[PDB]
Symmetry: C3
Subunit: 467 residues, 3 copies
């Protein structure tokens, strides 16, 4: 109900209180509690304080991280160390005798999102033997293993497939590990992942084709090839994947400080609240000597809206400033590896405001054509009479396309068919528009007309017009 919304704010308020409470535990300056990198330090400290082999990506039961401080002049890094069980202690009292890890996960989503915005992860994509071409499909691949079910929501088709192929490989040529106890422990790990990916697919032929891949005990090369095929297909006939807007702990923090009652107001990760919130919020970042603060700003705003693989046009359109392609950006990662000191770096306010707001979908657009097409298509002569013998020249020759020696042959062909139908400008979401921020409900949807300025669409593509 609005149950769903009051329990979402429950857990966001969770973060807020926590962060705030934490912020004095380090006596961090007011101004320093807003600094993004100090926030990430903290977030990944709570997660570092709750895992063992999952969640968060010379050591006891402690956990530290670089913490920055502007002191009588420049910035400096004071990496610290805290007791997990001491941090564990807070979270709970800030969440009322519970931990309701839903909070924990929310954060570790934001991190991924942020990452999907930052790191063009081609190098890993080849090792799997799939195509670097496929960034758009790799959502939340930086997601830790065993990551929350509602975290598997985020993962894109490409993210998932990879992971599976990764097991098939450990299976095909490495010690046959569906052979007994583990044979079932890590066969179900597999069986379920296929359905989850099966779950995300739009067309039925794709789903129909995921089954064949799952019904193969001791699966191998044919199966891994099938999965890449399936992965490619997802570029057009696209997968329905979630997109949640998740902010740095500090935003939620200052929000709570300024007096927001999140359990009163409720929250949704797909609605207005995240935009509203970003509008009224200041968050600083450090910037490397030769970097562009504006571009840092873009990077984070993108991250904040899981926007990494969105048509740059719409992104720029909602944003109110041109959102720029990845290789043209004048920035590296938000986080600062301990090499570069911090004598060089200055800090800066990040520009995270938007002109419009829009609703985050869990969809993939449209993808279909015909129910089962049952027509006869050709002729069988009965009589000895001179005449041509008709046949559907085109639909017949298309039937032989993508044919294969395996049981996915005509399922592949079907995709190829359905794929060929499509065109780069079949409209989707027809009707649904953006919103003025005053418009709190959905008064006026604004559909945008896109013989516009940018004209270029992909964040991780290649040049043609610059900046």
């Amino acid at each position: 109900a609005t149950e769903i919304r009051a329990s979402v704010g429950r857990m966001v308020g969770g973060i807020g209180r926590f962060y705030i409470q934490m912020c004095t535990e380090l006596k961090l300056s007011d101004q320093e509690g807003r600094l993004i990198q100090n926030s990430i330090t903290i977030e990944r400290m709570v997660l570092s304080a709750f895992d063992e082999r999952r969640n968060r990506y010379k050591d006891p039961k402690k956990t530290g991280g670089p913490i920055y401080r502007r002191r009588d002049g420049k910035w400096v890094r004071e990496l610290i160390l805290y007791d997990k069980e001491e941090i564990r202690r807070i979270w709970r009292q800030a969440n009322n005798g519970e931990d309701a890890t839903a909070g924990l996960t929310h954060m570790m989503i934001w991190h991924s999102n942020l990452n999907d915005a930052t790191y063009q992860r081609t190098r890993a994509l080849v090792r799997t033997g799939m195509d670097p071409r496929m960034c758009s499909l790799m959502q939340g691949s930086t997601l830790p293993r065993r990551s929350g079910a509602a975290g598997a929501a985020i993962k894109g088709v490409g993210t998932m497939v990879m992971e599976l192929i990764r097991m098939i490989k450990r299976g095909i040529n490495d010690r046959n590990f569906w052979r007994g106890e583990n044979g079932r422990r890590t066969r179900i790990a597999y069986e379920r992942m296929c359905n989850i990916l099966k779950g995300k697919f739009q067309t039925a032929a794709q789903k129909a084709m995921m089954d064949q891949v799952r019904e193969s005990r001791n699966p191998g090369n044919a199966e891994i090839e099938d999965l890449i095929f399936l992965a490619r297909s997802a570029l057009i006939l696209r997968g329905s994947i979630a997109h949640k807007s998740c902010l740095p702990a500090c935003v939620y923090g200052l929000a709570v400080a300024s007096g927001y009652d999140f359990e009163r107001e409720g929250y949704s990760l797909v609605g207005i609240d995240p935009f509203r919130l970003l509008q009224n919020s200041q968050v600083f970042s450090l910037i490397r000597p030769n970097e562009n603060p504006a571009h840092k700003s873009q990077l984070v705003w993108m991250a904040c809206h899981s926007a990494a693989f969105e048509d740059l046009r719409v992104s720029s359109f909602i944003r109110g400033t041109r959102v720029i392609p990845r290789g043209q950006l004048s920035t590296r990662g938000v986080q600062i590896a301990s090499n570069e000191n911090v004598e060089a770096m200055d800090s800066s306010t990040l520009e995270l405001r938007s002109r419009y707001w829009a609703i985050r979908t869990r969809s993939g657009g449209n993808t279909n054509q015909q129910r089962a097409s049952a027509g006869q298509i050709s002729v069988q002569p009965t009589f000895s009479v001179q005449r041509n013998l008709p046949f559907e020249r085109a639909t017949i020759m298309a039937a032989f396309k993508g044919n294969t020696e395996g049981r996915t042959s005509d399922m592949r062909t079907e995709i190829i068919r359905m794929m060929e139908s499509a065109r780069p400008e079949d409209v989707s979401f027809q009707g649904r528009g953006v919103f003025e921020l005053s418009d709190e409900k959905a008064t006026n949807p604004i559909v945008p007309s896109f013989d516009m300025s940018n004209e270029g669409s992909y964040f991780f593509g290649d040049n043609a017009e610059e900046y």
Copy 2:
């Protein structure tokens, strides 16, 4: 010789006498002996009276069926029961101390034919995992198992392939049944069917490709996929399948009553006699309240000439009235399931005459191109001299089409090549025309010009212009 023709009439006369003799055994009215549904009742009673596990599709050694009677008013159904050995008794005395089952089979052909005209058997085609697209190829699929060798003549390519795939399946994932005794009993069942289908194929590359499919003990997915490929191919490069004209027992019956001496005159199922015969013959049918007698007429005439998958143009052209597409017909099946009573139904004369007659082929048209094309096609530079390096851009790229990881790769490619060559209006049977019914021999062939009226070709296709 005309031996072949005098022994064909021997067995048709067979039917005629029988039917007649049978007709008084039920004292069926004169008018009632002509009714088609009463004829089918009888036909399938003789077959019901001769099988055990083949031929014909609360019970002793008997056999009955719905028999209809117009009584002092409307029609009514008087389903009966007879002793097989009593029916068995007649057939033989009507065939002179023999049964010469050639008769038996002839009938069970007509039934199939009739069925190929009536039932769009898509639902079954999917279960096999082949394409509903493929009606034209499904001739005599309604044919019972173990059906006569000269009944396997009728079967189309699609009918056959299905049947095989059906065994391969019972083989791949169901108890390995080529493993010993049955291992050979039902491996030869298989080995022979491939050759029979191999037999029907036109091109050599197809035949060449059937072999590879047969030479595989314990055959599976690759083989079943190969067979569908082969099945598709048969839509264009088409299979040579028989087409025999086979009438209801009653036609042959009244013919004999009216004094035809079939052994004197002889018969052929591919010549004039069937048309001649249909011309001079009346056969009534019952018709459901909201049905079109004309359309019933068409359905049966089609059935009577194995015309179900013929270009509607030629069919309409021979017929003398427009033969209409299947979904546009205002009728259901000829047979009446016992649900609908017969108080509603009236009967009607069926219009089975034709304007012209034509010769029934066992061919599939033309299909070929080149003997083995041996040319060099590219260049290997010997010298360091600046210049382009020639090559057959098109014939090379075509070579990579339909390539496969299996031993049918370039055999597939070859088909794909030969298939692509073809065009929906390569003329076939060049020269052979239709005939005026007076023209008893082959005086004047009439080749038809087909920028005509209908313009639409397939009986089981989809709309564009209606009725």
Copy 3:
């Protein structure tokens, strides 16, 4: 250094002395020492005198062959017999206490070359199940087994692949012969051949694809299919294969007689010396009654420059007369089978001069495109806003081409991609030209302009304009 050149002449001079020394051992007329067929008799006598199961393609430790003699009138054949160890004896004394088989091999190269010029070896290409289409790739297939490493240099891609498939076959369905001792003796025979062929390939994707073929103990149908695919690909994206100019022993012979000091002057099989040499040399051949001496001349000149698969244009261009297609030639083989007597045949001077000379490459032209193309190519909607969803329609659909159920799928696709890029007139060797024979070094390269006369390119192709 010029070490490389002084040791090449060492071994050519080898041949020369030998031949000469041999020529008096038969007291062969001066005029008869120049006759080509008598030279081949001798060459294959030395090789016949040095092998057991390799090198050279009712008998003791002897070796003879048809030797021809013009006697007081016509020509006649005096087939002889010599002791291997007697011939063995000479070669060595003519090569100074060594045999330096490098000579032996040089000859057995010329023979192959000659053969590649003469015999359109389609009949064998089918038996392997590869395409007759593929002459251009079959260099030195007539090469004996175990033929010298620097003889494997000559072999083209097609020659090689065949040989492998030939083992795979003896492997797939014939007694599993990688199973133990031989299991490794003739598995390494295999492993090495893949690398040698791998070695010859231009693109990396091809090489990358040869590996997968090699990493398969007990390899079969999938592998043999992979190799043909690879073979086809070599028609466009062509293989780097050596081309050495190797003359009949007699040329080298008369050269030495006339006083050339080959160890003084040095030799190269890729430079000017072979042309220079051919210019100043007379060599006679016998000609069958209905044959064209000019065409015999062409055949041998082609053979002499490993030119059999060269663009006829360049060949004619260097040659100075039109080099004619194979089926249009008015000659059969150089060698005379003992059936046809020699009463009919006359002899003739062969026209082996050239207008220009050019440098023999070991290259295959150009073949490439892009380093790893890493771009994003499509979009994943984040927001519910009405708009089309962009994607690279063409580069995506091309990705599904040549897909396969095997681990070479996208390696195949990659080739298909790279192959499609190409065009029959991408120039290669850009800059490198021919040479006037006076021009001893590389003063003036002559790049030829080829809107010329012939316009037809392949030696073993099919008609369009004749002679």
